C-alpha cells in the first residue's frame, strides 16, 4: 500500500536543503521516530517549519543539536541552550511567526492560497515588509502560503491508503502539515487495513499522505507532568 517497512527508508526522502514541515505541539503529537531517523541520515541545511523546536533532548531539538538546520520557522522556541547560540552565531536564521498565522500559512500553501490577510501582527515587527490593506475601516497584513518539500506528521491511526485519525490535542499542526508537503510521511501508532476507519471519523484524507510508517505508543514523553491526587 502506502506503507514503508522502516523510518530509515522513509528518511531517505528528505534531502540536503529541503523545507521540512513537522507536526506536533511541544512534545505532543510529534513524529519522534521520523526525526530520529532523520538525525541518523545526517541530512543538512534544512529549513524546518514547525510550531516549536521540541526540547534540546527530544523531537526537533535533535536536529538542531546535530547542526542540521539552516533556518527555523516557528511561533515559540522555549528552553534550548543549543538554540540560543546557533542563532547568535549567524549560523541559524530564525523566523518567529505568530502561531495562528503559522497554522493558516501552512494550510494556505496546502490549499493553493498564495496569500491571505489577517489583523494578527498589525503595528508590530511582524508587519514589516508585508502588504497592508484596509477592509471595513481596519488594517490587515498579507501573509504568504508556506509549502514544503517534505512534511513529517504523527497520527493515532493510519490505514494503508494513508487516511489518518488523531487523538486529543496530539492533532494540532499534523493535519495541516500533511497538506502542505510535496511528500507527506505519516508516522502512526497503529496501521490498520483500509476500511477499519469510519470515513466520517477520518481527520486527514488519504490523498494528502504519500507514505506511512509504524511508530511508538509506549514511551510518549510528557514534557511537564502536572497532576493532583
Amino acid at each position: 500500500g502506502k506503507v514503508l517497512s522502516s523510518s530509515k527508508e522513509a528518511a531517505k526522502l528528505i534531502h540536503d536543503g529541503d523545507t521540512l514541515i513537522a507536526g506536533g505541539f511541544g512534545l505532543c503529537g510529534i513524529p519522534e521516530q521520523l526525526i530520529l531517523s532523520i538525525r541518523d541520515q545526517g541530512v543538512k541545511d534544512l529549513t524546518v517549519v514547525s510550531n516549536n523546536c521540541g526540547v534540546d533532548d527530544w523531537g526537533l531539538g535533535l536536529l538542531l543539536a546535530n547542526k542540521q538546520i539552516k533556518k527555523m520557522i516557528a511561533s515559540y522556541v522555549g528552553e534550548n541552550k543549543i538554540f540560543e547560540r546557533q542563532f547568535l552565531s549567524g549560523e541559524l536564521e530564525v523566523e518567529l511567526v505568530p502561531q495562528g498565522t503559522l497554522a493558516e500559512r501552512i494550510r494556505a500553501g496546502g490549499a493553493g492560497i498564495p496569500g491571505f490577510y489577517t489583523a494578527t501582527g498589525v503595528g508590530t515587527s511582524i508587519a514589516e515588509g508585508k502588504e497592508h490593506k484596509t477592509f471595513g475601516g481596519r488594517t490587515y497584513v498579507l501573509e504568504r502560503g508556506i509549502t514544503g518539500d517534505v512534511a513529517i506528521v504523527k497520527a493515532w491511526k493510519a490505514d494503508t491508503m494513508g487516511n489518518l485519525i488523531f487523538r486529543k490535542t496530539a492533532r494540532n499542526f499534523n493535519p495541516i502539515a500533511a497538506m502542505a508537503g510535496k511528500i507527506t510521511i505519516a508516522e502512526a501508532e497503529e496501521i490498520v487495513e483500509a476500511g477499519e476507519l469510519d470515513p466520517d471519523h477520518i481527520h486527514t484524507p488519504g490523498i494528502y499522505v504519500q507514505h506511512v510508517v509504524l511508530g511508538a505508543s509506549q514511551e510518549k514523553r510528557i514534557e511537564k507532568r502536572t497532576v493532583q491526587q
Partner: protein, 212 residues
C-alpha cells in the same frame, strides 16, 4: 509578591460572565481558572486545539496526547471538542472567543501591549498576537512595578509589541484601567492605594474616571 498576585487574580475572575468561551494565556492568567465560581459555566479554549480545558488529571492518569498551551498535562470537561491548529485560530481570529486574559511585561497609554520579548534576554510569541487581535475583550493582569522600581505602565512601550492598541482593561496589584479609543482612564483601585500613589507609580497619562 503573593498578595500582589492574589489581588490581581481575584479581580480578573470577575471578568468571566456565564456562557463565555475564554482563553487564558500562559503565566499568571492560568491561575484564574481555579477561582471560577460554581454559578458560572464557561469553556476554556486551548489553542493547541481543545475547547473545554479541565483541571489536572489524577496522578497516574495523565495522558501525553492531552496538554494545555503551557505544555502541561490537563483534562477535558463535559462537552469538550478537539480540532486542528488552523481551526483553533479560525476561532480566535474570527472573533468567536469572548475574552482573553493575558500577562504583560508593559502596557501603554493607548492600550498597546508588549509581552513576548526582551531585546537581549528570544523566546517567541506563540498565540498571544492572534489572541490580542481576535478575542472580543482583551484583559491584561500585570504587576504595576518591576523589581528595580520602574513602572510598567508607560506612555510608550520600550519592548517589542505584542499588539497595537489592543488592551480593553488593565488590572494591576494597584489599579484597574479601561481604554476607550486610545485614552486610558483609571477606573478602580485596590485596597491600599489612592490616586496619588497611582500617579506616582505610573508613567502613562490617564484620565481619572468620573466615579472610581
Amino acid at each position: 509578591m503573593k498578595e500582589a498576585r492574589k489581588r490581581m487574580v481575584k479581580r480578573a475572575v470577575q471578568e468571566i460572565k456565564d456562557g463565555m468561551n475564554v482563553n487564558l494565556g500562559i503565566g499568571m492568567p492560568t491561575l484564574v481558572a481555579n477561582e471560577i465560581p460554581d454559578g458560572v459555566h464557561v469553556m476554556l479554549q486551548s489553542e493547541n486545539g481543545l475547547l473545554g480545558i479541565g483541571p489536572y488529571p489524577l496522578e497516574g492518569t495523565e495522558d501525553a496526547d492531552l496538554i494545555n498551551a503551557g505544555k502541561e498535562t490537563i483534562t477535558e470537561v463535559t462537552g469538550a471538542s478537539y480540532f486542528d491548529s488552523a481551526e483553533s485560530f479560525a476561532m480566535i481570529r474570527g472573533g468567536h472567543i469572548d475574552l482573553a486574559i493575558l500577562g504583560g511585561m508593559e502596557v501603554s497609554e493607548q492600550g498597546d501591549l508588549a509581552n513576548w520579548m526582551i531585546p537581549g534576554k528570544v523566546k517567541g510569541m506563540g498565540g498571544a498576537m492572534d489572541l490580542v487581535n481576535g478575542a472580543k475583550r482583551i484583559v491584561v493582569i500585570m504587576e504595576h512595578v518591576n523589581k528595580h522600581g520602574e513602572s510598567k505602565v508607560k506612555k510608550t512601550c520600550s519592548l517589542p509589541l505584542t499588539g497595537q492598541k489592543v488592551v480593553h482593561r488593565l488590572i494591576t496589584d494597584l489599579a484597574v484601567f479601561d481604554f476607550v479609543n486610545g485614552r486610558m482612564t483609571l477606573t478602580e483601585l485596590q485596597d491600599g492605594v489612592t490616586i496619588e500613589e497611582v500617579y506616582e507609580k505610573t508613567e502613562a497619562d490617564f484620565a481619572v474616571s468620573q466615579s472610581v
